[PDB]
A paper describes a structure:
Currently, the classification of the HLA‐B35 family into two groups (PY and Px), in the context of HIV‐I infection, is based on their binding preference at the F pocket to specific C‐terminal anchor residues of the peptide (PΩ). 8 The selective difference is attributed to an amino acid polymorphism in the HLA heavy chain 116, with a small serine or a larger phenylalanine/tyrosine in the PY and Px groups, respectively, changing the size of the F pocket.
By contrast, the HLA‐B*35:05 allomorph has a Ser116 favoring the PΩ‐Tyr to dock in a similar position as observed in the HLA‐B*35:01 molecule. This is also consistent with the higher thermal stability observed for both HLA‐B*35:01 and HLA‐B*35:05 compared with HLA‐B*35:03, altogether suggesting that the unclassified HLA‐B*35:05 allomorph belongs to the PY group. The small molecule of Bis‐Tris sits centrally in the cleft underneath the peptide interacting with P3‐Asp, P5‐Val, P6‐Ile and P7‐Tyr of the NY9 peptide, as well as with Asp114 and Tyr74 from the HLA‐B*35:05 molecule via a large network of hydrogen bonds and van der Walls contacts. A key characteristic of the HLA‐B*35:05 cleft that differs from the two other allomorphs studied here is the presence of a small residue in the D/E pockets that creates enough room for a small molecule to fit in the central part of the antigen‐binding cleft. This was also facilitated by the lack of secondary anchor residues of the NY9 peptide to bind to the HLA‐B*35 allomorphs, which would otherwise clash with the Bis‐Tris molecule. 42 As the HLA‐B*35:05‐NY9 crystal structure revealed the presence of a small molecule such as Bis‐Tris, it is possible that other small molecules such as drugs could bind in the cleft.
Residue numbers in the entry:
A (entry chain C): 1 to 9
B (entry chain A): 1 to 276
C (entry chain B): 1 to 99
The structure:
């Protein structure tokens, strides 16, 4: 299952 | 024995041809189990291995929302990176990421990974400690400062040591008949005359899983690294892999050459010769 | 900046004339990801060819497998034609059942 730590570069 | 889970994300801009494409694929070892493509007619997370099909509707909906959120984040990130590198709006650019966990033979976390690349070059990577970053240049230092402010490394460490390992162990149990089965290579040596003075000896390994294998030629017990043509390991299309190694040998000297094969599915390493 | 594809053309199972098999064209080590691959039978494009989902290696280079069902014969010639931004003209690699 993928991570949910989603932030723009 | 040792197992890994990895997600591979790719985002590519295409000015004048719509918004950037985002694709995500998930693997356990050498087996793909999921895919998401923003260019599909109806973008959604799809199963790619039979053992994942038993996951409920909640799993598929949650995964789709994560990949759709990443599609937007990666589109914003490509615009950010075009700015960090003072690039024109005309060119196509690519941003890739790979992350996941490696388990040892006992099922414990060996190490975590979280790396990204821009235009095929290393950009930023989470260090082995899961608490600091390695930025390749001044543009990646901008991302590093942003991620330090958002506590990204702490959140990734929590994922990599927790949920990542837990989901990987669940997948390994559900797919145990294939994921935990190593298929040894079927091996043979073929002989092909090059001319009157020389012939090629080719050592084949077919039908093996996982992809990791060692195939070497020795002449009188000495490794022939410089003189061996070793093809890249290639997928057969049915889960298994293929590889070959060839040496050009003087005619009459074939029996001084031995092919050695190492693979996890083998009861013992193999030594093969040309059998006329 | 860019990386040209490596190409291998081969069958899934050992080739036996008159027996159904799969013809594979594996393209790898390329960057950027856009690539055009056609499987050819006697110089003509085979239709309904399938391919794997885009993935990449530890060095960030992309790889794809293109495949189609085929029944090899003594005289039918098979090949894979590849085009990429790194190539001035498409590269044709013929299927040799010994490789």
């Amino acid at each position: 299952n993928p991570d949910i730590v989603i932030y723009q570069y | 024995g040792s197992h890994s889970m990895r997600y591979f994300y790719t985002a590519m801009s295409r000015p004048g041809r719509g918004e950037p494409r985002f694709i995500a694929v998930g693997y356990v070892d050498d087996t793909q189990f999921v895919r998401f493509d923003s260019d599909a007619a109806s973008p959604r997370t799809e199963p790619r291995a039979p053992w994942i099909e038993q996951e409920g509707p909640e799993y598929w909906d949650r995964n789709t929302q994560i990949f759709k959120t990443n599609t937007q984040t990666y589109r914003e990130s490509l615009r950010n990176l075009r700015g960090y590198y003072n690039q024109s709006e005309a060119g196509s650019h690519t941003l890739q990421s790979m992350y996941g966990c490696d388990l040892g033979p006992d099922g414990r976390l060996l190490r975590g990974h979280d790396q990204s690349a821009y235009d095929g070059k290393d950009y930023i990577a989470l260090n082995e400690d899961l608490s600091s970053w390695t930025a390749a240049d001044t543009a990646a230092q901008i991302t590093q400062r942003k991620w330090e402010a958002a506590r990204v490394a702490e959140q990734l460490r929590a994922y990599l040591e927790g949920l990542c390992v837990e989901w990987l162990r669940r997948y390994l149990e559900n797919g145990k008949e294939t994921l935990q089965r190593a298929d040894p290579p079927k091996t043979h040596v073929t002989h092909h005359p090059v001319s009157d003075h020389e012939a090629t000896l080719r050592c084949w390994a077919l039908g093996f899983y996982p992809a990791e294998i060692t195939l070497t030629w020795q002449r009188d017990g000495e490794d022939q690294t410089q003189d061996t043509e070793l093809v890249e390991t290639r997928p057969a299309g049915d889960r298994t892999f293929q590889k070959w190694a060839a040496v050009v040998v003087p005619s009459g000297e074939e029996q001084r050459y031995t092919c050695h094969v190492q693979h996890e599915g083998l009861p013992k390493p193999l030594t093969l010769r040309w059998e006329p | 900046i860019q990386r040209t594809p490596k190409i291998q053309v081969y069958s899934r199972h050992p080739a036996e004339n008159g027996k159904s098999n799969f013809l594979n064209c594996y393209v790898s080590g390329f960057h950027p990801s856009d690539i055009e691959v056609d499987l050819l039978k006697n110089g003509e494009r085979i239709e309904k060819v399938e391919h794997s989902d885009l993935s990449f290696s530890k060095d960030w280079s992309f790889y794809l497998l293109y495949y189609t069902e085929f029944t090899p014969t003594e005289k039918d010639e098979y090949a894979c034609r590849v085009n990429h931004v790194t190539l001035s003209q498409p590269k044709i690699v013929k299927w040799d059942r010994d490789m």
